[PDB]
Enzyme design. Structure first.
Site, PDB file in Angstrom:
ATOM      1  N   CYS A 205       0.913  -1.131   0.000  1.00 27.41           N
ATOM      2  CA  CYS A 205       0.000   0.000   0.000  1.00 27.41           C
ATOM      3  C   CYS A 205       0.947   1.174   0.000  1.00 27.41           C
ATOM      4  O   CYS A 205       2.151   0.984   0.148  1.00 27.41           O
ATOM      5  CB  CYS A 205      -0.881   0.011   1.253  1.00 27.41           C
ATOM      6  SG  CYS A 205       0.050  -0.106   2.783  1.00 27.41           S
ATOM      7  N   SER A 206       0.414   2.377  -0.156  1.00 26.98           N
ATOM      8  CA  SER A 206       1.223   3.578  -0.380  1.00 26.98           C
ATOM      9  C   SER A 206       2.560   3.621   0.390  1.00 26.98           C
ATOM     10  O   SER A 206       3.619   3.685  -0.228  1.00 26.98           O
ATOM     11  CB  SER A 206       0.394   4.828  -0.104  1.00 26.98           C
ATOM     12  OG  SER A 206       1.167   5.975  -0.397  1.00 26.98           O
ATOM     13  N   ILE A 209       3.028   0.027   5.487  1.00 28.67           N
ATOM     14  CA  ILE A 209       3.081  -0.263   6.926  1.00 28.67           C
ATOM     15  C   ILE A 209       1.713  -0.337   7.620  1.00 28.67           C
ATOM     16  O   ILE A 209       1.446  -1.280   8.367  1.00 28.67           O
ATOM     17  CB  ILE A 209       4.019   0.721   7.718  1.00 28.67           C
ATOM     18  CG1 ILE A 209       3.515   2.163   7.652  1.00 28.67           C
ATOM     19  CG2 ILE A 209       5.456   0.634   7.213  1.00 28.67           C
ATOM     20  CD1 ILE A 209       3.990   3.033   8.808  1.00 28.67           C
ATOM     21  N   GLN A 249      -0.901   1.154  11.784  1.00 31.07           N
ATOM     22  CA  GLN A 249      -0.628   2.552  12.063  1.00 31.07           C
ATOM     23  C   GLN A 249      -1.400   3.065  13.268  1.00 31.07           C
ATOM     24  O   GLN A 249      -0.802   3.604  14.187  1.00 31.07           O
ATOM     25  CB  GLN A 249      -0.896   3.405  10.825  1.00 31.07           C
ATOM     26  CG  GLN A 249      -0.655   4.867  11.024  1.00 31.07           C
ATOM     27  CD  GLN A 249      -0.915   5.693   9.780  1.00 31.07           C
ATOM     28  OE1 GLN A 249      -1.040   6.913   9.866  1.00 31.07           O
ATOM     29  NE2 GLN A 249      -0.993   5.044   8.618  1.00 31.07           N
TER      30      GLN A 249
END
Length: 272
Positions: A205-206, A209, A249
């Site tokens: 993903c971007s 994490i 996150q």
């Protein structure tokens, strides 16, 4: 640096295994889960403690770096890390950022060299490292064999060719997961996990994490629940943080993980 070691000792020893019953019928309160998450150290790499020249323009974020002990090496540099799986088995996943335009060729090189057959992409809809039909990215040709659209994800069957060899890769694009957030429900996420059960599994993903961390912690959690009827979510997250800093996150994402896994328990085949 004792502080690095206090941090590493926590990650190796922390644990809160939940019985299936407890998870389903008597979960830890939302507040208990925040507290628990907040004690989990980040384990981020310092830019100075990585020391590999000119890596900067192949990371999307300056503060999100691959841990050195687990760093994937293009046999130079890619923002990616080996990730341990169920029971600690080495190299079950590679977590990585989504490619940048100058890191596309590296990404395919990684996929080839590590013998990747499965790629999971976690995004939210409205850069393409895969074509509509075919094209070449450096020494690799990619050809798509098959596309099937599902609710929330698209399954792309493709091949990769280098010199005179050809390998099949399954690519799955999950498109209903907003950055720093969670999906609106957990069912589609579990279906995606079931899709993954058909060398390392690339997940990205971007930044690679937050959502990447949630997906993987969900697989392992499901694996734990299926095998043993218990899950240690804290420990799973500690294990990932050991392999790449900052996996998972937000506290909310961690609450959802408990939720995703309570649903997995409830949906395991039983007899009425």
């Amino acid at each position: 640096n004792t502080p690095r070691e206090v941090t590493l000792h926590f990650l190796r020893t922390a644990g809160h295994p939940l019985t299936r019953w407890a998870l389903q019928r008597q979960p830890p309160s939302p507040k208990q889960l925040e507290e628990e998450f907040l004690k989990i150290p980040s384990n981020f790499v310092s830019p100075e403690d990585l020391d590999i020249p000119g890596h900067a323009s192949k990371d999307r974020y300056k503060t999100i770096l691959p841990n050195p002990q687990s760093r994937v090496c293009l046999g130079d540099y890619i923002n990616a890390n080996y990730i341990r799986g169920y029971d600690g088995k080495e190299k079950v996943y590679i977590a990585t950022q989504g490619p940048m335009p100058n890191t596309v060729s590296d990404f395919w090189e990684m996929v080839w060299q590590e013998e990747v057959s499965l790629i999971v992409m976690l995004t939210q809809l409205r850069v393409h490292y895969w074509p509509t039909e075919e094209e070449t990215y450096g020494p690799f040709q990619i050809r798509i064999q098959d596309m099937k659209e599902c609710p929330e994800y698209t399954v792309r069957q493709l091949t990769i060719q280098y010199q005179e060899e050809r390998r099949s890769v399954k690519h799955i694009l999950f498109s209903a997961w907003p950055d720093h957030q969670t999906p609106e429900s957990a069912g589609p996420l579990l279906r995606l996990v079931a899709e993954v059960e058909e060398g390392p599994i690339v997940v990205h993903c971007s930044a690679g994490i937050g959502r990447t961390g949630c997906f993987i912690a969900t697989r392992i959690g499901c694996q734990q629940l299926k095998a043993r009827g218990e899950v240690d979510i804290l420990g799973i997250v500690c294990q990932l943080r050991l392999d790449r800093g900052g996996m998972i996150q937000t506290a909310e994402q961690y609450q959802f993980l408990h939720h995703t896994l309570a649903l997995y328990a409830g949906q395991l085949p039983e007899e009425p």
